[PDB]
Scaffold this active site. Structure first.
Site, PDB file in Angstrom:
ATOM      1  N   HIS A  68      -2.619 -10.055   5.662  1.00 33.06           N
ATOM      2  CA  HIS A  68      -1.536  -9.660   5.764  1.00 33.06           C
ATOM      3  C   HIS A  68      -0.377  -9.571   7.243  1.00 33.06           C
ATOM      4  O   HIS A  68      -1.465  -9.230   8.213  1.00 33.06           O
ATOM      5  CB  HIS A  68      -0.841  -8.558   4.555  1.00 33.06           C
ATOM      6  CG  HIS A  68      -0.906  -8.425   3.413  1.00 33.06           C
ATOM      7  ND1 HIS A  68      -0.639  -7.636   2.412  1.00 33.06           N
ATOM      8  CD2 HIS A  68      -0.735  -9.867   2.500  1.00 33.06           C
ATOM      9  CE1 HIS A  68      -0.786  -7.867   1.645  1.00 33.06           C
ATOM     10  NE2 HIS A  68       0.004  -9.593   1.255  1.00 33.06           N
ATOM     11  N   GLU A  85      -0.164  -6.649   9.056  1.00 34.60           N
ATOM     12  CA  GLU A  85      -0.881  -5.966   9.671  1.00 34.60           C
ATOM     13  C   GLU A  85      -2.404  -6.104   9.581  1.00 34.60           C
ATOM     14  O   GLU A  85      -2.974  -5.832  11.087  1.00 34.60           O
ATOM     15  CB  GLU A  85      -0.707  -4.380   8.547  1.00 34.60           C
ATOM     16  CG  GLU A  85      -1.057  -4.805   7.159  1.00 34.60           C
ATOM     17  CD  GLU A  85       0.386  -4.565   6.568  1.00 34.60           C
ATOM     18  OE1 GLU A  85       1.056  -3.929   6.221  1.00 34.60           O
ATOM     19  OE2 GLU A  85       1.144  -5.853   6.613  1.00 34.60           O
ATOM     20  N   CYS A 116       0.224  -2.009   2.371  1.00 36.73           N
ATOM     21  CA  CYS A 116       0.204  -2.352   1.024  1.00 36.73           C
ATOM     22  C   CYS A 116      -1.810  -1.101   0.996  1.00 36.73           C
ATOM     23  O   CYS A 116      -2.254  -1.153   1.596  1.00 36.73           O
ATOM     24  CB  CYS A 116      -0.450  -4.079   0.866  1.00 36.73           C
ATOM     25  SG  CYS A 116      -1.652  -4.256   1.850  1.00 36.73           S
ATOM     26  N   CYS A 146      -3.854  -3.483   2.905  1.00 38.94           N
ATOM     27  CA  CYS A 146      -3.794  -2.668   4.230  1.00 38.94           C
ATOM     28  C   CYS A 146      -3.876  -1.775   5.004  1.00 38.94           C
ATOM     29  O   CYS A 146      -4.230  -1.263   5.997  1.00 38.94           O
ATOM     30  CB  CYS A 146      -2.374  -3.754   4.403  1.00 38.94           C
ATOM     31  SG  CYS A 146      -1.216  -5.256   3.434  1.00 38.94           S
TER      32      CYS A 146
HETATM   33 ZN   LIG Z   1       0.057  -5.502   2.850  1.00 39.00          ZN
END
Ligand SMILES: [Zn+2]
Ligand SMILES: [Zn+2]
Lengths: 157, 150
Positions: free
Chosen positions: A53, A55, A83, A86
């Site tokens: 992802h 991040e 998320c 994350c």
């Molecule tokens: Zn994420």
């Protein structure tokens, strides 16, 4: 310069990321001492990595640059609200702050709902979409013992 | 009646503070003419005042006792090096001098680290962790103007 400009840079990254076919609509930026130490874009598909992802990608890069595993005195900017995965990463990394533009409801309207994961992380284990089984191994404490024993251990918490 | 005993007293207040569950590990005293004029302790949680630090409290009480807003002839003995807002409060209160035992390092090793605020205070508004915005108003000078008259 100001938080807006950096956050603006993160949303721009997400867009360039999409149009270039490298991944999903997510971008991130990490700054330290007013310097963009890292830029990340969601590249899950293009690099066969479900953990890739925006991040998480920025964190990995940021730490590599600092030759460290903690983001002290750093600020993380994401094009959208993190998320759960994350998020856990944020807390293991430890930036002093995090800014985000789009909310998670915005991501949901777009087809990227991460809510099911908040619901699951809140449940026990045996009561989960993906079943978790806890097997009893007499040696389950062995690695912690080997750790208490290891002298040259570099603590990371 | 001695520099050491006054500082010692601030430290003794610092303990009583923690113990009595009245707040964090911080105490302070202000003395005038060899006598203790006011005492302060960290009571932020118990009084819903995040500015209620020992030193800050001690000087508010003192100023009240003396019916003044300047402590130009008093001494502050504080159990630990002052927080930045406390330094500001000290520079506005303006006491003779200030003594302290614990340093900003000792407190940092107890979950109480203010250095991030030091850093922040130095950085210009834009860079600060907490978001700051400078909207410009076509009358943002009127308060000073009104002051030039009064
Ligand atoms: Zn994420
Ligand atoms: Zn203070």
């Amino acid at each position: 310069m100001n938080h807006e400009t950096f956050l603006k840079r993160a949303v721009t990254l997400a867009c360039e990321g999409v149009n270039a076919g490298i991944g999903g609509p997510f971008g991130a930026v990490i700054v330290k001492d007013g310097a963009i130490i890292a830029e990340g874009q969601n590249n899950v598909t293009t690099s066969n990595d479900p953990t890739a992802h925006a991040e998480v990608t920025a964190i990995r890069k940021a730490c590599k640059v600092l030759g460290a595993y903690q983001l002290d005195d750093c600020i993380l900017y994401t094009s959208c609200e993190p998320c759960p995965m994350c998020l856990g990463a944020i807390y293991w990394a430890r930036p002093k702050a995090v800014f985000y533009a789009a909310e998670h409801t915005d991501a949901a309207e777009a087809g990227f709902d991460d809510s099911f994961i908040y619901k699951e992380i809140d449940k026990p284990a045996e009561e989960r979409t993906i079943p978790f089984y806890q097997v009893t191994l007499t040696e389950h404490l062995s690695p912690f013992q080997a750790w208490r024993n290891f002298a040259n251990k570099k603590e990371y918490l």
